[PDB]
Amino acid sequence: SFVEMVDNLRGKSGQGYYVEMTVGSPPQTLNILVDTGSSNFAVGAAPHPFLHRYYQRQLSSTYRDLRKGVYVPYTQGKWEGELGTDLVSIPHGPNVTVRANIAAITESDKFFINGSNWEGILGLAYAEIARPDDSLEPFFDSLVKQTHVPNLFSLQLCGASVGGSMIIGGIDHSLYTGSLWYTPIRREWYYEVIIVRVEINGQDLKMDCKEYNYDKSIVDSGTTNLRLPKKVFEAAVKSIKAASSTEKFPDGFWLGEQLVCWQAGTTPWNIFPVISLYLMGEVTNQSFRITILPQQYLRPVEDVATSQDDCYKFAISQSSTGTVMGAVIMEGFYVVFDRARKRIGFAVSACHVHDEFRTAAVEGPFVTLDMEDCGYN
Numbered sequence: 252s253f254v255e256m257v258d259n260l261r262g263k264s265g266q267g268y269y270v271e272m273t274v275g276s277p278p279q280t281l282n283i284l285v286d287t288g289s290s291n292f293a294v295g296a297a298p299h300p301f302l303h304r305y306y307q308r309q310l311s312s313t314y315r316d317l318r319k320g321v322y323v324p325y326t327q328g329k330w331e332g333e334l335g336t337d338l339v340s341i342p343h344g345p346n347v348t349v350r351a352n353i354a355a356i357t358e359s360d361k362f363f364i365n366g367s368n369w370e371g372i373l374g375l376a377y378a379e380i381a382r383p384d385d386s387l388e389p390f391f392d393s394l395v396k397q398t399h400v401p402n403l404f405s406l407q408l409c410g411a412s413v414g415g416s417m418i419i420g421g422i423d424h425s426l427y428t429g430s431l432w433y434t435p436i437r438r439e440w441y442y443e444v445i446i447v448r449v450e451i452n453g454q455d456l457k458m459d460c461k462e463y464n465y466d467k468s469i470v471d472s473g474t475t476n477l478r479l480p481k482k483v484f485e486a487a488v489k490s491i492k493a494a495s496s497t498e499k500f501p502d503g504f505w506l507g508e509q510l511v512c513w514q515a516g517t518t519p520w521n522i523f524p525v526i527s528l529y530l531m532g533e534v535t536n537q538s539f540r541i542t543i544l545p546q547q548y549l550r551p552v553e554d555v556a557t558s559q560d561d562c563y564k565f566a567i568s569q570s571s572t573g574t575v576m577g578a579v580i581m582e583g584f585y586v587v588f589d590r591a592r593k594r595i596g597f598a599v600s601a602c603h604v605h606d607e608f609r610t611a612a613v614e615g616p617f618v619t620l621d622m623e624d625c626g627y628n
């Protein structure tokens with residue numbers, strides 16, 4: 252009965268995707284950000300300027316203090332709080348309740364977003380990257396251990412304000428078209444994968460494939476942009492600039508600072524290239540590719556002034572901690588986090604991104620020799 256979970260996600264562009272949950276007894280309702288790039292389940296538990304509400308431990312008869320502190324420093328943003336446990340349920344999810352670890356956030360810095368509508372975060376990655384250490388069992392692990400929910404979930408993140416689905420315990424076939432293509436989870440900490448080739452408008456970037464995964468490549472719904480290692484970022488930007496060199500953009504645009512606008516409905520999509528990321532496949536010397544359209548990496552932003560022009564931000568940025576296939580990359584694709592079989596699947600989503608003469612795609616099989624050499628050690 253996955254139909255009950257279809258459309259259970261909501262969000263605002265650049266502010267993540269959240270799902271409704273309840274914690275404690277009696278049930279306290281909170282919207283929680285869905286993040287495959289971390290492994291801690293945490294909720295605001297003290298007043299904060301941007302919080303419409305928060306978790307009140309004193310009002311929960313099932314709350315249990317773990318008498319231990321915790322803090323989590325993300326690439327951007329961080330919080331600290333107190334560990335404990337409580338009963339948790341997902342209204343638009345499995346019909347079960349489970350006792351899970353919960354970090355009550357007491358202090359935070361550039362974490363919560365003004366008027367986002369979510370008050371917590373659900374880290375869906377593995378125990379290896381949980382704070383304070385891997386002995387703090389992540390929410391999904393508790394769920395699978397305490398119930399009969401199968402060990403996998405899928406995410407259908409949709410663009411344009413935004414919505415989507417998190418299917419807990421399986422794959423819902425009505426949410427995608429064509430075939431699902433799988434890439435191995437390299438190691439169970441982040442959802443780490445290996446990129447074996449990159450092309451822009453069909454042109455090979457021709458880099459040592461190790462550069463694509465320096466120092467790792469991950470699938471992260473908690474990160475907005477496609478983030479690339481310095482060397483790859485430079486090559487990609489250089490290529491994208493050349494392709495769109497018939498227009499002029501502030502240098503701040505390419506740094507993800509300044510935004511660019513065009514007369515409503517005149518965005519020159521054709522001048523921006525498609526980006527193909529090839530991922531390691533399931534059989535020997537076999538890979539497959541996912542093609543990204545500019546409608547994905549040119550994130551639409553609300554016109555700070557007069558909403559008369561379509562404005563966008565460059566959603567590709569430089570990284571010093573490996574490639575990050577963030578939300579703009581996942582949008583338009585149905586992504587299966589098959590923990591049980593240590594693989595991540597991709598297929599064209601039912602809510603795929605449109606373009607007049609081009610289309611996002613997941614295509615295979617491709618032959619690719621020596622893919623093992625693409626992983627960084």
Ligand SMILES: CC(C)c1cccc(CNC[C@@H](O)[C@@H]2C[C@H](C)CCCCCCCCC(=O)N(C)[C@@H](C)C(=O)N2)c1
Pocket residue numbers: 265266267284286288289290323324325326327328362372380381471473474475476
């Ligand atoms: C938690 C540990 C394991 C960790 C340390 C370092 C990197 C990572 C990789 N995943 C990062 C991810 O978990 C982390 C999650 C966010 C703070 C959650 C709150 C904001 C969500 C909506 C705005 C997103 C803007 C954005 O792209 N951010 C805010 C990137 C930059 C980022 O950081 N995201 C994990």
